[PDB]
Amino acid sequence: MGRDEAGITGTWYNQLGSTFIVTAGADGALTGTYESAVGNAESRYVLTGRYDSAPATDGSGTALGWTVAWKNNYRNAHSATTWSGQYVGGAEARINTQWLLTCGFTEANAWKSTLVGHDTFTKV
Amino acid sequence: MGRDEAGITGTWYNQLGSTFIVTAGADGALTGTYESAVGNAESRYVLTGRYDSAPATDGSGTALGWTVAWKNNYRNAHSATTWSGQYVGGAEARINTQWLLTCGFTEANAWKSTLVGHDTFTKV
Amino acid sequence: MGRDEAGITGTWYNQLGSTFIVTAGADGALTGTYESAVGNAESRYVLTGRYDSAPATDGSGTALGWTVAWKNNYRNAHSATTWSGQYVGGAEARINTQWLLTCGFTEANAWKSTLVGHDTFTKV
Amino acid sequence: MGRDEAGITGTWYNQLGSTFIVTAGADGALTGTYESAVGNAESRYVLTGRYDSAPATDGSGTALGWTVAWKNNYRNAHSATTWSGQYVGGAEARINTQWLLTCGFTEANAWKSTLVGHDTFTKV
Ligand SMILES: O=C(CCCC[C@@H]1SC[C@@H]2NC(=O)N[C@@H]21)NCCCN(CCc1ccccn1)CCc1ccccn1
Ligand SMILES: O=C(CCCC[C@@H]1SC[C@@H]2NC(=O)N[C@@H]21)NCCCN(CCc1ccccn1)CCc1ccccn1
Ligand SMILES: O=C(CCCC[C@@H]1SC[C@@H]2NC(=O)N[C@@H]21)NCCCN(CCc1ccccn1)CCc1ccccn1
Ligand SMILES: O=C(CCCC[C@@H]1SC[C@@H]2NC(=O)N[C@@H]21)NCCCN(CCc1ccccn1)CCc1ccccn1
Ligand SMILES: [Cu+2]
Ligand SMILES: [Cu+2]
Ligand SMILES: [Cu+2]
Ligand SMILES: [Cu+2]
Ligand SMILES: [Cu+2]
Ligand SMILES: [Cu+2]
Ligand SMILES: [Cu+2]
Ligand SMILES: [Cu+2]
Ligand SMILES: [Cu+2]
Ligand SMILES: [Cu+2]
Ligand SMILES: [Cu+2]
Ligand SMILES: [Cu+2]
């Protein structure tokens, strides 16, 4: 059992109103679905990732990350986002992330292929 | 069958001499192992990710991403890296990425928790 | 006179309690001092940057950026931070930024040379 | 006199074929012009920045950064780029950077306001 397996598993919301539904496995796996409130997206997309299933016990956060490729049965935005961040437990648990969204572009446009941002997820 | 399922599946090397061994599934899954030539790492770590399994056919790259949590049976660096990028096919295939490495830190050190970099993977 | 010359000029505070004191020139220059509440820093450091002195008038923010090299008469942390972001006017004006902190490192450690984060500045 | 004042001052080119013309001052100032080979840009734009004028002498690079706001007498792309990186001296001197390009956008589009990339500058 990962230390924060129960704390991570569940439904999370970010500041854009997107919905992140995840299950943390005892082995460090993250599996679930993502629904983005913004951009070229509709409904749920598959996500997978990893988390540190034996974090430090000195008050540090729990490192994790996951990926969504923005293809599902409704749309294909030819892009992928990875979120990299940490789970912070407690009364108001949070997942604090930064993210990289890469679009599949021609070689001449590679310089403008990647957006960077930051999302904060909470359980309410 | 994903368009670039065969082109992605296999063993990749980046400019640091790290080894990225991946299988692309027809459904958009990436599964495999990562071995980093640098940092607080030894041997292979589980990785999972996603890729666009029906990319555009106008010469654009194929968007993808994956995560490694830096825990295995030898070490735990209490951190996770996500790579976000695109697969570029052809005679000298490449996966061009940018990445975010987040460490699990205390709340007071969250400002210095995340490194950013860029890795280029080739098949030789 | 830049459109937001008066709105930008002045004293700003971020969520870490750092102090950003800036003057915007009519030509697009930013000049001032930065005092960081965290890290290897003490007192004020010179900053310089640029801003869009004729922004759009459709409600968009005003793009800007600036650099601090972390050397002053007290300390030298052999590093530089650049903030890239936008000034958002109104009752609760804000400068929303993302930033890159690069340390001068040996060639073998270049992969871990750059931190990424995000700072929000307000006038109170 | 900054340690790398002479090594930095001059004309640099990146992998896109952009031209970075800079003067390093003894006080740590960077001043000059930037001409981008790509994007919504034409001719030269003002740049300003800072560099560590007393770097370590253990083989580490010299940290620096600079900003361009993409307004000049020809065009205004309502955006700013900051480059954060290090000067690496020697036979084939280099400035290795990562950069953040922020567009002035409405509040609803702030999530897609910032591109991230990496540029390598050389003297030839
Ligand atoms: O939206 C998508 C998929 C949805 C992305 C949702 C993002 S994930 C990070 C964040 N957290 C979140 O909860 N929600 C957002 N994938 C293509 C992302 C194209 N751009 C901007 C949007 C757009 C939508 C429709 C038409 C054109 N654009 C990327 C920026 C860019 C780069 C270069 C040239 C032009 N544009
Ligand atoms: O190394 C790791 C795991 C290995 C990471 C390998 C990276 S993935 C991106 C890149 N592509 C690649 O192929 N290989 C590298 N995880 C903790 C990463 C701690 N820092 C730097 C390294 C280190 C090793 C040992 C002791 C201290 N550090 C992060 C930087 C930081 C931030 C704040 C304070 C101090 N340091
Ligand atoms: O603090 C500095 C200068 C102050 C930086 C303040 C930052 S600007 C962005 C942000 N907004 C803000 O208002 N305040 C912060 N420059 C060296 C920054 C060394 N690291 C972490 C701090 C530290 C302080 C003392 C001793 C060791 N570290 C960088 C992370 C790293 C990378 C690789 C290996 C180890 N560590
Ligand atoms: O080009 C500019 C100014 C030139 C930028 C040149 C860049 S600096 C980093 C890099 N190193 C370099 O040497 N050269 C490049 N400023 C607006 C940058 C708009 N986007 C992409 C380009 C574009 C040109 C014309 C029309 C539309 N786009 C940003 C991506 C985005 C985000 C959200 C929605 C849509 N697009
Ligand atoms: Cu430990
Ligand atoms: Cu954050
Ligand atoms: Cu654009
Ligand atoms: Cu399509
Ligand atoms: Cu790249
Ligand atoms: Cu440090
Ligand atoms: Cu305009
Ligand atoms: Cu922001
Ligand atoms: Cu470290
Ligand atoms: Cu020193
Ligand atoms: Cu670099
Ligand atoms: Cu777009």
XYZ file of C-alpha atoms and ligand atoms in Angstrom:
652
model
C 0.000 0.000 0.000
C 1.439 3.359 -1.038
C 1.667 5.837 1.822
C -0.676 8.313 0.110
C -2.630 5.758 -1.912
C -5.913 6.723 -0.223
C -5.085 10.437 -0.126
C -4.462 10.577 -3.887
C -7.206 8.259 -5.121
C -10.379 10.110 -5.959
C -11.758 13.092 -7.809
C -9.833 16.367 -8.031
C -10.692 19.789 -9.473
C -8.359 22.509 -10.671
C -8.755 26.302 -10.855
C -10.056 26.142 -14.449
C -12.830 23.768 -13.332
C -11.271 20.713 -14.979
C -11.889 17.260 -13.411
C -9.063 14.816 -12.650
C -10.295 11.349 -11.587
C -7.464 9.077 -10.513
C -6.724 5.772 -8.831
C -3.336 5.319 -7.158
C -2.096 1.747 -7.057
C 0.048 0.207 -4.345
C 2.837 -0.155 -6.953
C 3.044 3.566 -7.810
C 0.676 3.546 -10.781
C -1.765 6.357 -11.533
C -4.713 5.531 -13.790
C -7.864 7.472 -14.574
C -9.548 10.113 -16.696
C -9.196 13.837 -17.301
C -11.858 16.274 -18.425
C -10.635 19.749 -19.381
C -12.867 22.774 -18.949
C -10.813 24.655 -21.591
C -9.155 24.162 -24.952
C -9.771 21.673 -27.754
C -11.297 18.980 -25.566
C -14.637 17.389 -24.823
C -15.582 14.729 -22.263
C -13.082 12.317 -20.689
C -9.558 11.339 -21.828
C -7.414 8.477 -20.591
C -4.606 9.391 -18.258
C -1.747 7.415 -16.819
C 1.114 8.326 -14.555
C 3.315 7.448 -11.566
C 3.735 8.592 -7.982
C 6.260 8.023 -5.205
C 4.568 5.241 -3.216
C 7.009 5.478 -0.262
C 7.507 9.207 0.271
C 9.609 10.807 2.946
C 7.974 11.253 6.361
C 9.474 14.669 7.186
C 6.508 16.712 5.935
C 7.626 16.747 2.291
C 5.039 16.426 -0.461
C 4.627 13.259 -2.551
C 6.060 13.600 -6.081
C 3.887 12.445 -8.964
C 3.128 13.042 -12.608
C 0.759 12.007 -15.328
C 0.061 12.372 -19.051
C -3.028 12.934 -21.168
C -2.950 12.569 -24.944
C -5.819 14.684 -26.246
C -7.445 12.020 -28.402
C -10.708 10.303 -27.474
C -13.800 9.113 -29.324
C -15.020 12.701 -29.860
C -11.947 14.719 -30.788
C -8.250 14.630 -31.492
C -6.313 17.815 -30.683
C -2.975 16.206 -31.727
C -1.292 17.194 -28.462
C -0.319 15.840 -25.064
C -0.066 17.430 -21.623
C 2.141 16.192 -18.799
C 1.597 17.414 -15.253
C 4.541 17.206 -12.837
C 3.973 18.053 -9.202
C 3.349 16.952 -5.645
C 0.484 15.784 -3.487
C 0.273 17.772 -0.218
C -1.900 16.090 2.405
C -3.898 17.537 5.257
C -7.210 19.201 5.950
C -7.168 20.959 2.577
C -5.256 18.439 0.482
C -3.738 19.775 -2.734
C -1.894 18.562 -5.800
C 0.362 21.410 -6.935
C 1.553 20.973 -10.535
C 3.339 22.555 -13.384
C 2.549 21.249 -16.849
C 3.854 21.081 -20.413
C 1.447 20.872 -23.354
C 3.140 19.837 -26.618
C 1.359 20.012 -29.984
C 2.343 17.849 -32.904
C 3.666 20.464 -35.363
C 5.816 20.541 -38.477
C 9.559 20.793 -38.003
C 9.515 24.480 -38.981
C 7.081 25.263 -36.137
C 8.742 23.172 -33.410
C 9.877 26.349 -31.660
C 6.219 27.182 -30.820
C 5.104 23.639 -30.021
C 5.066 23.655 -26.188
C 2.972 25.602 -23.692
C 3.862 25.761 -19.992
C 1.505 26.458 -17.113
C 0.574 25.574 -13.566
C -2.572 23.933 -12.111
C -3.623 23.545 -8.477
C -6.022 20.666 -7.745
C -8.195 20.446 -4.657
C -10.738 17.876 -3.499
C -13.649 20.359 -3.399
C -2.882 0.055 -34.757
C -1.514 3.503 -33.941
C 0.005 5.259 -36.939
C 3.450 5.455 -35.315
C 3.083 2.384 -33.109
C 6.054 0.660 -34.773
C 8.079 3.866 -35.096
C 7.823 4.614 -31.364
C 8.165 1.109 -29.940
C 11.740 0.231 -29.134
C 14.860 1.472 -27.422
C 15.807 5.158 -27.427
C 18.860 7.055 -26.159
C 19.148 10.690 -25.168
C 22.104 13.106 -25.186
C 22.998 12.276 -21.559
C 23.268 8.581 -22.479
C 20.048 7.608 -20.701
C 18.018 4.642 -22.059
C 14.274 4.861 -22.747
C 12.682 1.480 -23.587
C 9.048 1.807 -24.598
C 6.157 -0.105 -26.109
C 3.395 1.868 -27.832
C -0.002 0.208 -27.763
C -2.671 0.477 -30.433
C -4.845 2.331 -27.873
C -2.350 5.158 -27.231
C -0.617 3.640 -24.209
C 3.113 3.952 -23.559
C 4.674 1.418 -21.192
C 8.295 0.615 -20.446
C 11.398 1.417 -18.436
C 13.786 4.334 -18.047
C 17.417 4.245 -17.000
C 19.018 7.619 -16.268
C 22.723 8.164 -16.816
C 22.652 11.089 -14.330
C 21.205 12.095 -10.987
C 19.953 10.056 -8.037
C 19.089 6.953 -10.036
C 20.321 3.433 -10.612
C 19.059 0.743 -12.997
C 15.549 0.709 -14.492
C 12.387 2.563 -13.381
C 8.821 1.979 -14.506
C 7.420 4.474 -16.949
C 3.966 5.009 -18.342
C 2.526 7.543 -20.718
C 0.278 8.305 -23.704
C 0.703 9.210 -27.355
C -1.553 10.432 -30.152
C -2.358 7.161 -31.944
C -3.991 8.883 -34.962
C -1.729 11.843 -35.714
C -2.155 14.307 -38.521
C -0.760 13.281 -41.917
C 0.563 16.708 -42.965
C 4.135 16.135 -41.762
C 3.450 17.150 -38.152
C 5.124 15.254 -35.328
C 3.233 12.839 -33.056
C 2.537 14.286 -29.584
C 3.332 12.099 -26.592
C 4.374 12.190 -22.971
C 5.389 9.940 -20.143
C 6.226 9.915 -16.432
C 8.863 8.254 -14.279
C 8.637 8.262 -10.491
C 12.192 7.810 -9.243
C 11.519 4.899 -6.906
C 12.603 1.335 -7.661
C 14.001 -1.582 -5.677
C 17.406 0.127 -5.314
C 16.669 3.771 -4.570
C 13.999 6.351 -3.948
C 14.850 9.924 -4.978
C 11.372 11.195 -3.922
C 10.799 12.897 -7.275
C 9.077 12.436 -10.614
C 9.939 13.548 -14.144
C 7.436 14.069 -16.943
C 8.601 14.352 -20.538
C 6.310 16.145 -23.006
C 7.226 16.141 -26.669
C 6.811 14.725 -30.144
C 7.972 11.760 -32.168
C 9.447 12.835 -35.536
C 9.743 9.969 -38.011
C 12.115 9.426 -40.892
C 15.621 8.233 -41.600
C 16.906 9.694 -38.332
C 13.823 9.374 -36.145
C 13.761 11.568 -33.044
C 11.669 12.180 -29.958
C 12.101 15.847 -29.036
C 11.030 16.577 -25.445
C 10.943 19.114 -22.731
C 10.663 17.826 -19.181
C 9.701 18.825 -15.645
C 11.329 17.145 -12.642
C 9.474 17.788 -9.365
C 10.938 16.844 -5.974
C 8.783 16.169 -2.961
C 9.743 19.089 -0.682
C 8.344 20.830 2.372
C 5.855 23.620 1.798
C 8.505 26.252 2.570
C 10.718 24.933 -0.256
C 8.004 24.472 -2.900
C 9.397 27.421 -4.850
C 12.560 25.388 -5.650
C 10.837 22.051 -6.225
C 10.787 21.822 -10.051
C 13.587 21.586 -12.602
C 12.982 22.119 -16.325
C 15.079 20.791 -19.184
C 15.035 19.313 -22.653
C 16.078 15.855 -23.942
C 16.467 14.637 -27.524
C 16.124 10.869 -28.040
C 17.440 9.011 -31.060
C 17.407 5.337 -32.014
C 21.219 5.037 -32.185
C 3.728 57.380 -22.505
C 3.182 53.625 -22.329
C -0.459 52.662 -21.891
C 0.206 50.932 -18.558
C 3.225 53.014 -17.565
C 1.492 54.275 -14.407
C -0.194 50.943 -13.675
C 3.121 49.054 -13.718
C 5.374 51.590 -12.011
C 5.558 51.066 -8.284
C 6.078 48.466 -5.605
C 4.796 44.905 -6.004
C 4.731 41.894 -3.668
C 4.541 38.222 -4.541
C 3.152 35.222 -2.632
C 6.559 34.447 -1.072
C 6.705 37.987 0.349
C 9.376 39.164 -2.091
C 9.431 42.867 -3.115
C 9.585 43.988 -6.756
C 10.142 47.755 -7.166
C 9.940 48.859 -10.782
C 9.746 51.922 -12.991
C 8.209 51.553 -16.453
C 9.529 53.988 -19.028
C 7.580 55.442 -21.928
C 9.925 53.524 -24.282
C 9.138 50.061 -22.865
C 11.988 49.868 -20.358
C 11.648 48.291 -16.919
C 14.221 49.283 -14.300
C 14.316 48.699 -10.563
C 15.244 46.394 -7.711
C 14.219 42.968 -6.455
C 14.387 41.639 -2.921
C 13.731 37.913 -2.513
C 12.216 36.551 0.677
C 13.702 33.098 -0.102
C 16.853 31.455 -1.390
C 20.470 32.612 -1.488
C 19.701 36.324 -1.458
C 19.896 39.312 0.839
C 18.740 42.904 0.308
C 18.164 44.462 -3.125
C 19.388 43.332 -6.574
C 19.327 45.269 -9.824
C 16.658 44.293 -12.291
C 16.000 45.292 -15.858
C 13.391 44.269 -18.365
C 10.910 45.271 -21.083
C 7.157 45.608 -21.447
C 4.721 46.137 -24.309
C 4.180 49.911 -24.141
C 1.252 49.890 -26.624
C -0.816 46.858 -25.639
C -4.038 45.755 -27.232
C -7.220 47.448 -25.992
C -9.484 44.372 -26.079
C -9.019 43.438 -22.411
C -5.797 41.476 -22.961
C -3.009 41.708 -20.403
C 0.232 43.619 -21.047
C 3.204 41.322 -21.774
C 6.433 42.009 -19.911
C 9.536 40.371 -18.533
C 12.581 41.106 -16.465
C 15.847 39.600 -15.225
C 17.723 39.577 -11.935
C 21.296 38.321 -11.687
C 21.772 37.269 -8.073
C 24.937 39.250 -7.404
C 25.011 42.382 -5.251
C 27.375 43.895 -2.697
C 26.442 41.264 -0.080
C 26.254 37.965 -1.939
C 26.702 36.213 -5.241
C 24.521 33.136 -5.816
C 25.934 32.636 -9.362
C 22.458 32.445 -10.893
C 19.879 34.511 -12.741
C 16.080 34.495 -12.755
C 13.900 35.721 -15.604
C 10.208 36.380 -15.057
C 7.922 36.296 -18.110
C 4.307 37.306 -17.702
C 1.578 39.896 -18.019
C 0.283 42.911 -16.157
C -3.496 42.695 -15.569
C -5.041 46.028 -14.600
C -8.107 46.830 -12.557
C -9.226 47.132 -8.968
C -6.901 44.324 -7.882
C -4.069 44.737 -10.372
C -1.802 41.721 -10.814
C 1.371 40.706 -12.596
C 1.075 36.988 -13.355
C 4.449 35.398 -14.167
C 6.263 32.217 -14.798
C 9.999 32.215 -14.179
C 13.220 30.373 -14.990
C 16.123 30.363 -12.527
C 19.411 29.186 -14.077
C 22.500 28.430 -11.976
C 25.990 28.607 -13.378
C 27.049 24.935 -13.222
C 29.708 22.722 -14.755
C 28.943 21.147 -18.108
C 28.296 17.768 -16.462
C 25.541 19.289 -14.291
C 23.837 21.399 -16.976
C 20.856 19.042 -16.942
C 19.972 20.225 -13.393
C 20.792 23.899 -13.907
C 17.312 25.445 -14.339
C 14.365 25.736 -11.964
C 10.888 26.725 -13.165
C 8.132 28.299 -11.102
C 5.341 30.836 -11.052
C 4.898 34.070 -9.039
C 1.828 36.287 -8.691
C 2.511 39.928 -7.765
C -0.064 42.257 -6.264
C 0.113 45.877 -5.136
C -0.833 45.107 -1.508
C 35.406 44.540 -15.576
C 33.145 41.488 -15.529
C 35.039 38.218 -15.829
C 33.272 37.276 -19.075
C 32.574 40.821 -20.252
C 34.619 40.317 -23.435
C 33.451 36.730 -23.941
C 29.770 37.730 -23.868
C 29.919 41.017 -25.765
C 29.334 40.569 -29.461
C 27.071 38.946 -32.003
C 25.482 35.545 -31.376
C 23.354 33.238 -33.538
C 20.922 30.554 -32.458
C 19.751 27.347 -34.164
C 16.752 29.111 -35.757
C 19.109 31.639 -37.376
C 18.100 34.490 -35.067
C 20.692 37.207 -34.253
C 21.456 38.310 -30.684
C 23.724 41.392 -30.498
C 24.728 42.232 -26.946
C 27.073 44.386 -24.906
C 27.983 43.235 -21.394
C 28.822 46.032 -18.990
C 31.295 45.849 -16.132
C 28.335 46.275 -13.730
C 26.421 43.191 -14.933
C 24.206 44.922 -17.490
C 23.257 43.375 -20.827
C 22.070 45.743 -23.556
C 21.505 45.189 -27.255
C 19.158 44.052 -29.995
C 17.443 40.837 -31.034
C 16.306 39.817 -34.492
C 14.138 36.695 -34.676
C 14.180 34.487 -37.750
C 10.712 33.133 -36.814
C 7.349 34.262 -35.510
C 5.600 37.634 -35.559
C 8.759 39.718 -35.778
C 10.673 41.841 -38.242
C 14.035 43.599 -37.886
C 15.620 44.487 -34.532
C 14.035 44.742 -31.055
C 15.518 46.250 -27.917
C 16.780 43.817 -25.339
C 18.032 44.260 -21.819
C 19.221 41.838 -19.199
C 21.749 40.951 -16.485
C 24.657 38.566 -16.055
C 26.824 37.383 -13.171
C 29.862 39.663 -13.537
C 31.982 37.725 -10.990
C 31.291 34.068 -11.756
C 32.837 31.107 -10.031
C 36.258 29.994 -11.290
C 35.699 26.227 -10.980
C 34.627 25.690 -14.600
C 30.972 26.602 -14.016
C 29.098 28.587 -16.646
C 28.161 32.258 -16.184
C 24.451 32.766 -15.399
C 22.600 35.423 -17.370
C 19.214 36.373 -18.726
C 17.524 38.922 -20.902
C 14.117 40.088 -22.130
C 12.694 41.210 -25.456
C 9.269 42.823 -25.716
C 8.107 42.213 -29.276
C 7.242 45.807 -30.126
C 9.346 47.956 -32.452
C 8.675 50.550 -35.139
C 7.424 47.884 -37.584
C 5.277 45.521 -35.540
C 3.801 44.781 -32.157
C 3.194 41.100 -31.362
C 1.921 41.938 -27.827
C 4.288 39.440 -26.207
C 7.615 39.189 -24.419
C 10.299 36.502 -24.316
C 12.776 35.993 -21.491
C 15.846 33.829 -21.989
C 17.479 32.329 -18.885
C 20.745 30.475 -19.265
C 24.513 30.403 -19.030
C 27.512 31.521 -21.026
C 30.029 28.673 -21.515
C 33.449 29.889 -22.633
C 36.143 28.183 -24.646
C 37.067 27.409 -28.219
C 33.415 26.999 -29.200
C 31.754 29.425 -26.803
C 28.031 28.912 -26.245
C 25.106 30.528 -24.484
C 22.715 27.731 -23.512
C 19.220 29.027 -22.690
C 15.707 28.089 -21.925
C 13.041 30.685 -22.628
C 9.477 31.696 -21.791
C 7.353 33.596 -24.315
C 4.227 35.165 -22.778
C 1.455 36.689 -24.904
C -0.864 39.350 -23.594
C -4.206 37.489 -23.570
C -7.616 37.882 -21.977
C -8.105 36.415 -18.526
C -10.065 33.476 -19.965
C -7.089 32.491 -22.154
C -4.331 32.933 -19.552
C -3.877 29.164 -19.386
C -2.499 29.181 -22.975
C -0.481 32.387 -22.685
C 3.087 31.054 -22.259
C 5.328 29.052 -24.579
C 8.519 27.370 -23.355
C 11.536 26.427 -25.439
C 15.302 26.253 -25.566
C 17.848 28.118 -27.745
C 21.580 27.505 -28.146
C 23.638 30.512 -29.288
C 27.071 30.262 -30.858
C 29.470 32.885 -32.189
C 29.515 31.472 -35.746
O -6.420 22.210 -26.453
C -5.916 21.102 -26.423
C -6.434 20.046 -25.400
C -7.001 20.602 -24.079
C -5.846 21.248 -23.282
C -6.304 21.686 -21.903
C -5.167 22.250 -21.078
S -4.066 20.935 -20.328
C -3.098 22.085 -19.234
C -4.276 22.829 -18.679
N -4.932 22.291 -17.557
C -6.275 22.097 -17.877
O -7.054 21.615 -17.058
N -6.722 22.444 -19.153
C -5.578 22.950 -19.825
N -4.849 20.755 -27.319
C -4.283 21.632 -28.352
C -3.619 22.951 -27.833
C -3.653 24.037 -28.949
N -3.302 25.389 -28.368
C -4.299 26.082 -27.413
C -5.849 25.698 -27.487
C -6.622 25.650 -28.919
C -7.910 25.079 -29.107
C -8.522 25.060 -30.385
C -7.878 25.610 -31.512
C -6.603 26.160 -31.269
N -6.031 26.172 -30.027
C -1.794 25.447 -28.075
C -1.106 26.852 -28.202
C -0.510 27.216 -29.628
C 0.856 27.040 -29.991
C 1.273 27.418 -31.289
C 0.372 27.960 -32.215
C -0.961 28.117 -31.791
N -1.356 27.760 -30.542
O 17.924 12.724 -9.442
C 16.786 12.293 -9.422
C 16.386 11.123 -10.372
C 17.149 11.044 -11.709
C 16.767 12.271 -12.567
C 17.368 12.181 -13.957
C 16.940 13.335 -14.838
S 15.215 13.138 -15.539
C 15.313 14.573 -16.718
C 16.660 14.238 -17.286
N 16.721 13.333 -18.360
C 17.544 12.268 -18.000
O 17.739 11.333 -18.772
N 18.136 12.270 -16.735
C 17.696 13.471 -16.119
N 15.805 12.849 -8.533
C 16.044 13.926 -7.563
C 16.491 15.298 -8.170
C 17.305 16.105 -7.116
N 17.995 17.276 -7.780
C 19.169 17.011 -8.748
C 20.000 15.652 -8.618
C 20.547 15.153 -7.168
C 21.063 13.852 -6.919
C 21.513 13.479 -5.627
C 21.470 14.385 -4.549
C 20.947 15.658 -4.851
N 20.521 16.000 -6.104
C 16.959 18.363 -8.110
C 17.464 19.849 -8.077
C 17.330 20.606 -6.688
C 16.245 21.464 -6.346
C 16.246 22.097 -5.081
C 17.288 21.897 -4.167
C 18.334 21.046 -4.569
N 18.335 20.446 -5.786
O 18.860 31.302 -4.471
C 19.264 32.007 -5.378
C 18.808 33.496 -5.460
C 17.413 33.811 -4.885
C 16.350 33.124 -5.771
C 14.945 33.513 -5.349
C 13.892 32.912 -6.255
S 13.692 33.827 -7.876
C 12.160 32.927 -8.426
C 11.420 33.036 -7.126
N 10.667 34.199 -6.887
C 11.120 34.788 -5.707
O 10.626 35.835 -5.296
N 12.160 34.177 -5.004
C 12.489 33.017 -5.755
N 20.155 31.485 -6.375
C 20.692 30.118 -6.408
C 19.631 28.975 -6.543
C 20.192 27.655 -5.937
N 19.080 26.641 -5.783
C 17.987 26.876 -4.717
C 18.309 27.805 -3.456
C 19.676 27.590 -2.598
C 20.163 28.516 -1.637
C 21.368 28.272 -0.931
C 22.121 27.101 -1.155
C 21.593 26.220 -2.120
N 20.427 26.472 -2.787
C 18.698 26.084 -7.163
C 18.186 24.600 -7.205
C 19.290 23.481 -7.423
C 19.609 22.909 -8.688
C 20.603 21.905 -8.754
C 21.272 21.466 -7.604
C 20.904 22.064 -6.385
N 19.945 23.022 -6.323
O 5.887 35.739 -32.472
C 6.118 36.573 -31.615
C 7.493 37.310 -31.606
C 8.691 36.518 -32.165
C 8.982 35.333 -31.218
C 10.243 34.595 -31.628
C 10.588 33.478 -30.666
S 11.411 34.076 -29.094
C 11.876 32.391 -28.460
C 12.449 31.873 -29.747
N 13.796 32.153 -30.034
C 13.862 32.823 -31.254
O 14.941 33.193 -31.711
N 12.678 33.084 -31.946
C 11.646 32.537 -31.139
N 5.141 36.887 -30.611
C 3.799 36.300 -30.514
C 3.749 34.751 -30.292
C 2.408 34.179 -30.836
N 2.479 32.669 -30.908
C 3.395 32.006 -31.959
C 3.792 32.820 -33.277
C 2.651 33.583 -34.153
C 2.936 34.528 -35.176
C 1.892 35.164 -35.894
C 0.539 34.879 -35.623
C 0.315 33.937 -34.598
N 1.335 33.331 -33.919
C 2.389 32.082 -29.490
C 1.708 30.674 -29.353
C 0.142 30.673 -29.099
C -0.459 30.563 -27.812
C -1.870 30.556 -27.713
C -2.680 30.652 -28.852
C -2.026 30.748 -30.094
N -0.671 30.747 -30.186
Cu 13.864 8.760 1.660
Cu 3.351 25.206 -8.538
Cu 0.266 32.445 -31.791
Cu -6.587 15.927 -37.221
Cu 12.690 20.728 -27.716
Cu 20.512 24.973 -4.838
Cu -2.280 45.133 -31.757
Cu 0.763 32.004 -14.339
Cu 19.025 18.025 -5.754
Cu 31.255 32.156 -5.520
Cu 19.448 24.039 -22.244
Cu -3.552 26.532 -30.455
